[PDB]
JSON list of C-alpha atoms in Angstrom, two decimals:
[
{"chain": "P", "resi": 1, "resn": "UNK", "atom": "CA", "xyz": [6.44, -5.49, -18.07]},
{"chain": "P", "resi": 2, "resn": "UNK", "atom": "CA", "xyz": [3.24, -5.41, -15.90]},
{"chain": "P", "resi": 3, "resn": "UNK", "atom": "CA", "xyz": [4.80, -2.85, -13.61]},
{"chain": "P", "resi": 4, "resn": "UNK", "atom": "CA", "xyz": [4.91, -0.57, -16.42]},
{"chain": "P", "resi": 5, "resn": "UNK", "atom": "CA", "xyz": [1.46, -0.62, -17.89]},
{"chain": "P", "resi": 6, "resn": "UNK", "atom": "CA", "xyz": [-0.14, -0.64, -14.27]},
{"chain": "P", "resi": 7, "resn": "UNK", "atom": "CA", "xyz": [1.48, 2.93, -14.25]},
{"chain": "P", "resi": 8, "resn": "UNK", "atom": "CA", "xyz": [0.00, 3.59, -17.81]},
{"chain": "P", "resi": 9, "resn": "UNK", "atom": "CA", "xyz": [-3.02, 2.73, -16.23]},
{"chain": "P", "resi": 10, "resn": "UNK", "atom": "CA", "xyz": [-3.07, 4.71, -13.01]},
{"chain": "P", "resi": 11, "resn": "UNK", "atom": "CA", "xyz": [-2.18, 7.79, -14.87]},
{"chain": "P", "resi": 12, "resn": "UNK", "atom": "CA", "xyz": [-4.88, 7.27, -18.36]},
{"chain": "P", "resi": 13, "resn": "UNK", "atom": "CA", "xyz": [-7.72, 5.56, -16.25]},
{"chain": "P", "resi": 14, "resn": "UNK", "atom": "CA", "xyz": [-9.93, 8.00, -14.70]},
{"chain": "P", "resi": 15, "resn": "UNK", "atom": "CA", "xyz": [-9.30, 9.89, -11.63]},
{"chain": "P", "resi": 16, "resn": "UNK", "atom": "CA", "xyz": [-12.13, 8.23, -9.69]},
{"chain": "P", "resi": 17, "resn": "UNK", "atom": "CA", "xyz": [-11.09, 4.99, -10.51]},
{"chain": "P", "resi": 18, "resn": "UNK", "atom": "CA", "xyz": [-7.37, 5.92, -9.65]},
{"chain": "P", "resi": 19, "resn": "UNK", "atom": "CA", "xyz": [-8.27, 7.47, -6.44]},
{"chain": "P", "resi": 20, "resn": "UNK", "atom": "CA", "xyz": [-10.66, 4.50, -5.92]},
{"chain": "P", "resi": 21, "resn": "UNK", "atom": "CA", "xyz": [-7.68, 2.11, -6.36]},
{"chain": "P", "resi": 22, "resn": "UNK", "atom": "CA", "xyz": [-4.84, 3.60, -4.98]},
{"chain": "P", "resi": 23, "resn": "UNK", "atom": "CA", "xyz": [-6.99, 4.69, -1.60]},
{"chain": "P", "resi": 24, "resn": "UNK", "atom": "CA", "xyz": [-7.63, 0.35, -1.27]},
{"chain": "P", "resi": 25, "resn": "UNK", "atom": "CA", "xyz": [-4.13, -0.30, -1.68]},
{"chain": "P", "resi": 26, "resn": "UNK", "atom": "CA", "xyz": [-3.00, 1.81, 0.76]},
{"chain": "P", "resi": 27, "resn": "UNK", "atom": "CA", "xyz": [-5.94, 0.35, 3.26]},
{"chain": "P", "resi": 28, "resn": "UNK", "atom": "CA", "xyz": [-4.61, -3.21, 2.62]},
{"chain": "P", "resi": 29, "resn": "UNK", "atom": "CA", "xyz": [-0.85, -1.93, 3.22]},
{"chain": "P", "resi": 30, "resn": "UNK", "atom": "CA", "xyz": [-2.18, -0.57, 6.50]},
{"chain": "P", "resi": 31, "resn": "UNK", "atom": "CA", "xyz": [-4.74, -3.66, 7.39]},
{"chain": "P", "resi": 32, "resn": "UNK", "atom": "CA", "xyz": [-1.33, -5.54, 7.09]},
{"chain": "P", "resi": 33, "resn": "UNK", "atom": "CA", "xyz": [1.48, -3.44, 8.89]},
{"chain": "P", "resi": 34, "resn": "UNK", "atom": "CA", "xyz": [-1.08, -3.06, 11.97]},
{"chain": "P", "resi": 35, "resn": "UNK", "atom": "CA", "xyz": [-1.66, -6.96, 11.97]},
{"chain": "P", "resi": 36, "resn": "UNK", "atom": "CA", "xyz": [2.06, -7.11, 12.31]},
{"chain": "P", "resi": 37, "resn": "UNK", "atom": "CA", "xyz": [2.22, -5.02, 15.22]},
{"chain": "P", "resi": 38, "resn": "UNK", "atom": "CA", "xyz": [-1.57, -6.48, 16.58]},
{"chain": "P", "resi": 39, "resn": "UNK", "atom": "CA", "xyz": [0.71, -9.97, 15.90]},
{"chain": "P", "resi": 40, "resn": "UNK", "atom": "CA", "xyz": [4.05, -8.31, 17.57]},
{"chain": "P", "resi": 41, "resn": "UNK", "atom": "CA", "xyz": [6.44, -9.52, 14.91]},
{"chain": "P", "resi": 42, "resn": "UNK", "atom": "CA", "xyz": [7.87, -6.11, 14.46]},
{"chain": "P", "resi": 43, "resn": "UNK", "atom": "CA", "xyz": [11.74, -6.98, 14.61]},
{"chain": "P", "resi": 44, "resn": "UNK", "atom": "CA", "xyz": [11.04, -10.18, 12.65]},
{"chain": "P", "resi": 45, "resn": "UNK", "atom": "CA", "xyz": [9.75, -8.12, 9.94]},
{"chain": "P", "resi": 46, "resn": "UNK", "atom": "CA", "xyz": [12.27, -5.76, 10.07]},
{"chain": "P", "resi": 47, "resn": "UNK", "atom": "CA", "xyz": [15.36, -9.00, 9.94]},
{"chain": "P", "resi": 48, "resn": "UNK", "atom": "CA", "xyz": [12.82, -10.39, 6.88]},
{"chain": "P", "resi": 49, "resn": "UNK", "atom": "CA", "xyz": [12.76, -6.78, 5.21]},
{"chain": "P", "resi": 50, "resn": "UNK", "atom": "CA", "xyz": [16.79, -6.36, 5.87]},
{"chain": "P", "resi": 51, "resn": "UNK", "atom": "CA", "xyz": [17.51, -9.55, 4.26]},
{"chain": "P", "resi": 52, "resn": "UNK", "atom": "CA", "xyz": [15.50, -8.27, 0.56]},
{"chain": "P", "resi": 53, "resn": "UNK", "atom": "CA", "xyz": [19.01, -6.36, -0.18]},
{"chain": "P", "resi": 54, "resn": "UNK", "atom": "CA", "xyz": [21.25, -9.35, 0.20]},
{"chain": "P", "resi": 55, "resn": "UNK", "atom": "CA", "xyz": [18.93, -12.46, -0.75]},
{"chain": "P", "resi": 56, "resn": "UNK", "atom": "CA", "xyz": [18.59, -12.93, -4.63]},
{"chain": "P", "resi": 57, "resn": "UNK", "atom": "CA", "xyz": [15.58, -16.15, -4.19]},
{"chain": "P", "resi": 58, "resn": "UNK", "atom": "CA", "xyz": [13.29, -13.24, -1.83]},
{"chain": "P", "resi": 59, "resn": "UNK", "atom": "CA", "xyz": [14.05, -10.32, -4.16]},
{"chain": "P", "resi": 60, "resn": "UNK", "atom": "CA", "xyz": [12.27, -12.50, -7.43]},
{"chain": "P", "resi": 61, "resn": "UNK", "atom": "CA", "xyz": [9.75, -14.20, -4.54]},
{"chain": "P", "resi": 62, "resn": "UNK", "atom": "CA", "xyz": [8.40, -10.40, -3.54]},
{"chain": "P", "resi": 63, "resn": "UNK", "atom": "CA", "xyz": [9.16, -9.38, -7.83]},
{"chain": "P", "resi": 64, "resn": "UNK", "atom": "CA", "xyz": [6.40, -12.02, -8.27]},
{"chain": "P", "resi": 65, "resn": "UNK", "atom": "CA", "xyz": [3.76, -11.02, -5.68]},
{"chain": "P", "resi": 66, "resn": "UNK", "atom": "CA", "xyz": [4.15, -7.07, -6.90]},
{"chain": "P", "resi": 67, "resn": "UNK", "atom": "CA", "xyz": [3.25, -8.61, -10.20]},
{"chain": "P", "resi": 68, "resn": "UNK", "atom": "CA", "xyz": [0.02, -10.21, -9.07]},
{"chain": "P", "resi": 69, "resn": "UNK", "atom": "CA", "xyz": [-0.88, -7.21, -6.86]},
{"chain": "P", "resi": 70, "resn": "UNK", "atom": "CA", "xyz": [-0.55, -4.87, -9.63]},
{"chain": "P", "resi": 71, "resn": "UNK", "atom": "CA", "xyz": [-2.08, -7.42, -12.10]},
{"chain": "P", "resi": 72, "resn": "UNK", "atom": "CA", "xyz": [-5.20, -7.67, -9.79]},
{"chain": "P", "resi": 73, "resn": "UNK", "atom": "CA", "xyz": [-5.24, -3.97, -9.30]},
{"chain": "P", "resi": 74, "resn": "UNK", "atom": "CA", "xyz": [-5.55, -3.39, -12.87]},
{"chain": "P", "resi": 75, "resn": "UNK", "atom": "CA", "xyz": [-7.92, -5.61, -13.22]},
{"chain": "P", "resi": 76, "resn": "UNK", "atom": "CA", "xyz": [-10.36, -3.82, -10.74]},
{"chain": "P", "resi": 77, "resn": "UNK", "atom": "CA", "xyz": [-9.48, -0.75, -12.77]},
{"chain": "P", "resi": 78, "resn": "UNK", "atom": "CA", "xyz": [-10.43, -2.18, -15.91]},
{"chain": "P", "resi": 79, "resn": "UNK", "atom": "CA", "xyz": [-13.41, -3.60, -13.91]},
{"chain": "P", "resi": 80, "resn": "UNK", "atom": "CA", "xyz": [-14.83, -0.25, -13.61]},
{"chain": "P", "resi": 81, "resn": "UNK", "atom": "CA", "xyz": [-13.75, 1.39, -16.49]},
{"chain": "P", "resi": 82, "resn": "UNK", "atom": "CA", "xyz": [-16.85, -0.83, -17.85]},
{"chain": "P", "resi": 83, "resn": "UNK", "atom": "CA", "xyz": [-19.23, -0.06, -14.83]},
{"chain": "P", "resi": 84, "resn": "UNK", "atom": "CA", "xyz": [-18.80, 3.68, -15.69]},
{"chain": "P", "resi": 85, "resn": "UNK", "atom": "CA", "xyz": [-21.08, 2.58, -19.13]},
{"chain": "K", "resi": 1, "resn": "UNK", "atom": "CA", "xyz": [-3.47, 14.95, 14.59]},
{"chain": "K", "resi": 2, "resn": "UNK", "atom": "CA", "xyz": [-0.77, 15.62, 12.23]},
{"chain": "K", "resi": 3, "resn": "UNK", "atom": "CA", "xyz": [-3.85, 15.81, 9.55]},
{"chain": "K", "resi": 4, "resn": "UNK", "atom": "CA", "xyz": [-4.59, 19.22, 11.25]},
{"chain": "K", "resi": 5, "resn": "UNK", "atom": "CA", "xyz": [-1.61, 20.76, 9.45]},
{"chain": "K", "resi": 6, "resn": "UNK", "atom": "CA", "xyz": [-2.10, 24.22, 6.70]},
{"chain": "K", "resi": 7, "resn": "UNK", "atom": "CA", "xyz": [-0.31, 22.00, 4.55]},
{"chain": "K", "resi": 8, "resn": "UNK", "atom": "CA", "xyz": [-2.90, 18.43, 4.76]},
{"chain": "K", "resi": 9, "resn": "UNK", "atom": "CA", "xyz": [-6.40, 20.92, 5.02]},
{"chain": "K", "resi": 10, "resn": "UNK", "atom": "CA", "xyz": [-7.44, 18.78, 7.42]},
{"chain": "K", "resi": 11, "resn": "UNK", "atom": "CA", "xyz": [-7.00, 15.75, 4.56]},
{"chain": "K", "resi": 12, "resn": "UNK", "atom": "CA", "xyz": [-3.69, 14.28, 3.91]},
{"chain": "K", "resi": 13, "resn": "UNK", "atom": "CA", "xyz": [-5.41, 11.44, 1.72]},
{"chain": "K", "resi": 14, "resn": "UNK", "atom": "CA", "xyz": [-6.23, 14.01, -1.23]},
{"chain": "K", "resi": 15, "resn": "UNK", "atom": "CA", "xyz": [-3.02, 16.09, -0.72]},
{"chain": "K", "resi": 16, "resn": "UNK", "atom": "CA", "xyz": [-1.42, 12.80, -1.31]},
{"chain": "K", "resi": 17, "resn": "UNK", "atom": "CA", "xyz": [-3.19, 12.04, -4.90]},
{"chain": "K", "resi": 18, "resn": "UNK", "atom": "CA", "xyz": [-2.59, 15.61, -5.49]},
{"chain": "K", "resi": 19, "resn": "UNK", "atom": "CA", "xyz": [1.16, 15.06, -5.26]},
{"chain": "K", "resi": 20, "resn": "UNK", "atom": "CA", "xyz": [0.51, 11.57, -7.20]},
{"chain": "K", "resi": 21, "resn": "UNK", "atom": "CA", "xyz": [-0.78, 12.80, -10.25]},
{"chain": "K", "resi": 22, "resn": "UNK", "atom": "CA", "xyz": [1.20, 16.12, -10.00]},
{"chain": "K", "resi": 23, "resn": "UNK", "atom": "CA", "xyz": [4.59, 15.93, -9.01]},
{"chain": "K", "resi": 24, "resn": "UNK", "atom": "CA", "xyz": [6.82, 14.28, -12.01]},
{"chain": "K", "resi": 25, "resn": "UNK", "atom": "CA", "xyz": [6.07, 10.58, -13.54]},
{"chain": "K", "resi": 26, "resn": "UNK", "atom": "CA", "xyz": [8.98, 10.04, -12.63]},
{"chain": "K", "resi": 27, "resn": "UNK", "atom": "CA", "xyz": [9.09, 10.69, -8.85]},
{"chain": "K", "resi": 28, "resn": "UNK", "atom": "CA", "xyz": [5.01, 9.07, -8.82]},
{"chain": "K", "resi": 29, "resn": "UNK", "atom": "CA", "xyz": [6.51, 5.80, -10.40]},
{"chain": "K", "resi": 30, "resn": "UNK", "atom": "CA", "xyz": [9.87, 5.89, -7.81]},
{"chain": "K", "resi": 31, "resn": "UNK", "atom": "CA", "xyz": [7.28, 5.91, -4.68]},
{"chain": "K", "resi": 32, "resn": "UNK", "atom": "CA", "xyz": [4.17, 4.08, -5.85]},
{"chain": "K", "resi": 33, "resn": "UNK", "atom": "CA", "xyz": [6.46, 0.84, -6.60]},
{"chain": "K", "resi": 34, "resn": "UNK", "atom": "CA", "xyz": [8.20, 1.40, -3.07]},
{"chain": "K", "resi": 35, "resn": "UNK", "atom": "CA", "xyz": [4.59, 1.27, -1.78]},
{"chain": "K", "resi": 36, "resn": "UNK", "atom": "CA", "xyz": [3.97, -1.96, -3.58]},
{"chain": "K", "resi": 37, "resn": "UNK", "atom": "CA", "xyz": [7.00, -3.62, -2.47]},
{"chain": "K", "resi": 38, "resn": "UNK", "atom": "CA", "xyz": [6.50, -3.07, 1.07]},
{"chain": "K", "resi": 39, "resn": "UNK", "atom": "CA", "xyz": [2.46, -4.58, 0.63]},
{"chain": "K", "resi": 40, "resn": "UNK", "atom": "CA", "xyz": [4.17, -7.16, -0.87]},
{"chain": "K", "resi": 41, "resn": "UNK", "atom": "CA", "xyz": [7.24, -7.70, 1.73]},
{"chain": "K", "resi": 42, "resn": "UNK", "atom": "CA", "xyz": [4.52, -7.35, 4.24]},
{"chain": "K", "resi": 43, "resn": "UNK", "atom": "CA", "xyz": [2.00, -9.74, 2.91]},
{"chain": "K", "resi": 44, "resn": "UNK", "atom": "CA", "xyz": [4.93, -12.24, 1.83]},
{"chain": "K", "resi": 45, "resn": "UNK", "atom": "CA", "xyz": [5.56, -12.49, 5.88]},
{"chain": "K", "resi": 46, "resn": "UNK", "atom": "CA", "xyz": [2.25, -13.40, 6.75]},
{"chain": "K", "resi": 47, "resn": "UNK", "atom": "CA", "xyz": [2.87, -16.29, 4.44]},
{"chain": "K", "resi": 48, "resn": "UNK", "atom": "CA", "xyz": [6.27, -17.12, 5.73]},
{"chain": "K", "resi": 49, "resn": "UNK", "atom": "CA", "xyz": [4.92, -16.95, 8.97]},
{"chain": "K", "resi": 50, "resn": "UNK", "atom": "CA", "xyz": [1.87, -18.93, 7.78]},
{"chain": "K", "resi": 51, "resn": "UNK", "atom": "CA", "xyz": [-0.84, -16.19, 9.39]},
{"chain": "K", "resi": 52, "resn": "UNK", "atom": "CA", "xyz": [-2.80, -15.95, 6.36]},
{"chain": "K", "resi": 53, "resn": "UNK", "atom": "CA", "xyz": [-6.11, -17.74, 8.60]},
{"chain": "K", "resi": 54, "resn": "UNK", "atom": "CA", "xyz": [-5.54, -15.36, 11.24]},
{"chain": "K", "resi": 55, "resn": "UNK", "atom": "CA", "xyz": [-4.92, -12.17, 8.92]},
{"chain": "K", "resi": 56, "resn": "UNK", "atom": "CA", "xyz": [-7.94, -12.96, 7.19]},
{"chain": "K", "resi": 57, "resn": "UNK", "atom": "CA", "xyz": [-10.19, -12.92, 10.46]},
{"chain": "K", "resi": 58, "resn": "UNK", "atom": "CA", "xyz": [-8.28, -9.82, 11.68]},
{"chain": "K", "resi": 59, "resn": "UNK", "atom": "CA", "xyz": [-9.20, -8.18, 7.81]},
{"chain": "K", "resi": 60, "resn": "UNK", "atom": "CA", "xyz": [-13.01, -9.09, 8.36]},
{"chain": "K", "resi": 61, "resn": "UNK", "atom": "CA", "xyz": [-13.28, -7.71, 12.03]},
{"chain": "K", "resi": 62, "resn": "UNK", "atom": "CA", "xyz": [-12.72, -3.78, 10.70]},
{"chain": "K", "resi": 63, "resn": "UNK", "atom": "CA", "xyz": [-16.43, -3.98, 9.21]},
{"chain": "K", "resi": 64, "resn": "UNK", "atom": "CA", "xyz": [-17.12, -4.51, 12.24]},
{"chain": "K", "resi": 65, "resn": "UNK", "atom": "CA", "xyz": [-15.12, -2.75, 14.80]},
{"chain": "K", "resi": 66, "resn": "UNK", "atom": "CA", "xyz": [-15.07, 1.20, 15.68]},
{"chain": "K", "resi": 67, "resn": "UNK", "atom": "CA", "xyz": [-11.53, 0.94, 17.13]},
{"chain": "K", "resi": 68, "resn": "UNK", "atom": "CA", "xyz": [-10.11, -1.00, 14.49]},
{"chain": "K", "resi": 69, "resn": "UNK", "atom": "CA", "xyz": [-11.48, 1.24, 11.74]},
{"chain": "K", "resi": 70, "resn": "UNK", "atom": "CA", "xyz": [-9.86, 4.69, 13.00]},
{"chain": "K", "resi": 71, "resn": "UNK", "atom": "CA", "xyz": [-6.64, 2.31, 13.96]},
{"chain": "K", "resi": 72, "resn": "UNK", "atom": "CA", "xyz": [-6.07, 1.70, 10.63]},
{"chain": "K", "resi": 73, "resn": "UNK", "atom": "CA", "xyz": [-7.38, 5.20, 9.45]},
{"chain": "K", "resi": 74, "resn": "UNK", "atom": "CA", "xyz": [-4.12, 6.28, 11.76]},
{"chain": "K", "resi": 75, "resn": "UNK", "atom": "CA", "xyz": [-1.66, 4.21, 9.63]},
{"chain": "K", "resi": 76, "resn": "UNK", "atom": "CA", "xyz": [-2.78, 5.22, 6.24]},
{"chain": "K", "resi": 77, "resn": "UNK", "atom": "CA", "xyz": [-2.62, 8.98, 6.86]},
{"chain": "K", "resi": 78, "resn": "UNK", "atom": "CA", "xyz": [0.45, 7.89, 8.35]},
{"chain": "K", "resi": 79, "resn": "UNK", "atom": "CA", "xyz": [1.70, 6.37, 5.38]},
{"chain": "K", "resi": 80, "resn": "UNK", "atom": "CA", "xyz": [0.57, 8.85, 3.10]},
{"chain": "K", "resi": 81, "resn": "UNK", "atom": "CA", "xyz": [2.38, 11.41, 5.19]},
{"chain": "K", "resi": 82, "resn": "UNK", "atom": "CA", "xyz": [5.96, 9.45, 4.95]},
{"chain": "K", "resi": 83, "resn": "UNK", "atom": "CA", "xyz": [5.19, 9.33, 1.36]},
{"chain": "K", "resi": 84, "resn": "UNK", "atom": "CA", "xyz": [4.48, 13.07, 0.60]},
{"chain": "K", "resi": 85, "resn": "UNK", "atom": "CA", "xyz": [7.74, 13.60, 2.68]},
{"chain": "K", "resi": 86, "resn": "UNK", "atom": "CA", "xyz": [9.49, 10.96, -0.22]},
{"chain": "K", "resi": 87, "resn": "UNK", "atom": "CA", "xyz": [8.28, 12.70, -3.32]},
{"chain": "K", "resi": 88, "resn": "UNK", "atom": "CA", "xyz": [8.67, 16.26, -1.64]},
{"chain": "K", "resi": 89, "resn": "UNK", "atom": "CA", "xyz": [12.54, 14.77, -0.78]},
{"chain": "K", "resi": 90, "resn": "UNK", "atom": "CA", "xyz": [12.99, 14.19, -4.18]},
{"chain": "K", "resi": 91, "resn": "UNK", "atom": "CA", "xyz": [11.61, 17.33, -5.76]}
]
């Protein structure tokens, strides 16, 4: 489960890392909801984001990105756990 | 100006680790992977909508721009905020 040990890592890497990578996740999240608005696809989102609870082919299509993001993530964690030498 | 709040001290970004790595694993877990679902639901619509070209130039202008930069500051206290109010729901 890479879910799972992304948490293990969040919580047992250090907190500067942790802080580091959680702060540039939530940056992207934002870079991306104000594109969205910038774009003015707002209700389009929000008939894509509606149709996650019914749609079994988007639920494992959005499964799989979380997987990269967190793989990614952890890898800029692990990253820097070597800088810190 | 919602940061300006006893309860942020003026930062809602470090109240909001705070609450990460203090409330239960649990609760952290719950709303971290909500987080991570929505960057992904979001970013999976820029694909379906085939923006990627134009997100990309829209990601490399905040370097650059002074408006942008605080416009995006805006949505991730924002965010934080919502999420603070999720973990202290669930307490």
């Amino acid at each position: 489960n890479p879910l799972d040990k992304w948490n293990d890592i969040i919580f047992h890497a250090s907190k500067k890392l942790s802080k580091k990578e959680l702060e540039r996740l939530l940056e992207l999240l934002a870079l991306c909801e104000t594109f969205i608005e910038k774009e003015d696809l707002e209700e389009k989102f929000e008939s894509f984001a509606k149709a996650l609870r019914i749609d079994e082919e988007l639920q494992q299509k959005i499964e799989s990105r979380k997987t990269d993001i967190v793989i990614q993530s952890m890898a800029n964690i692990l990253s820097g756990l070597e800088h810190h030498h």
